[PDB]
């Protein structure tokens with residue numbers, strides 16, 4: 001009879017991380033008859049949308065004390081009391097600050113349990129990275145995060161790389177027929193520079209050789225700035241804008257139908273779920289080799305390419321070769337190149353990472 005507690009600071013209730021957590025919780029509560037799951041949130045308000053939790057048992061610590069020393073002390077106390085009521089065997093922290101809370105509350109509460117980190121963002125691009133050292137073991141969604149954890153002094157043996165899940169598909173998006181233009185796809189929020197660097201996408205494509213089209217599914221404040229840039233570069237007649245779409249992969253299948261590659265030019269990424277989605281549909285991905293994620297999914301020459309951050313020359317080379325056919329990715333086998341990310345095997349490896357450390 002195992003009970004697992006997932007804890008973190010309040011989240012919005014919409015986002016990639018929330019989806020992964022509710023699914024991991026839900027399949028946990030079916031695994032061994034039903035080893036039980038519940039949540040604990042540290043909140044300064046109750047603005048978190050509760051939809052994703054409708055089937056999940058959860059409790060909260062509310063404190064809007066403005067001095068953070070006092071607020072954290074109250075959070076630790078509230079969690080210490082919940083620990084006594086609940087007696088979890090395992091506590092998994094979905095952010096780094098909660099590893100400190102869980103550690104301090106374990107000592108205060110006198111309870112025994114094992115503390116795992118399971119952060120969903122690169123430690124270096126987020127606020128409280130040094131609190132990672134308060135967890136017992138670590139669940140890393142990428143090789144990049146495992147490296148940042150080791151950088152703080154943690155032994156590699158105490159860190160399991162668990163990736164993140166994606167659903168198996170039963171449709172393959174084929175390449176365009178030969179003699180048709182190459183079809184590139186960009187799916188994501190538009191930022192001209194900043195995190196997403198749509199500037200780099202447009203700069204690279206403008207320098208390429210051969211016939212191509214770019215389909216952009218997404219929106220953002222930089223829309224007009226990106227549209228002006230495509231006009232400036234003279235590529236606007238090869239770009240089709242779809243705005244934000246609730247079902248981007250339905251738009252791909254029904255409206256675009258044939259895709260050469262998905263492109264991602266980001267400066268950084270928390271976890272680029274978009275790449276996994278694309279490869280689940282057999283679409284190769286050419287991505288910047290940024291912190292973090294793309295290098296754990298992309299196998300160069302097999303399901304796409306990586307380029308060193310800022311190496312737009314290299315990015316262009318990858319585009320030219322896939323347009324010409326000098327390099328060809330086989331869409332029919334690409335879905336199998338991300339085997340370890342698919343739901344069932346993901347959960348088996350995730351489950352084994354938790355219980356192997358006990």
Ligand SMILES: O=c1ccn([C@@H]2O[C@H](COP(=O)(O)OP(=O)(O)O)[C@@H](O)[C@H]2O)c(=O)[nH]1
Pocket residue numbers: 016187188189217218219243244245246247248270273274277
């Ligand atoms: O028009 C869009 C563009 C993005 N996505 C989805 O949003 C995620 C990636 O979006 P984003 O680039 O904003 O990543 P984030 O910054 O939210 O982590 C992927 O799962 C996409 O399938 C979507 O549903 N509609």
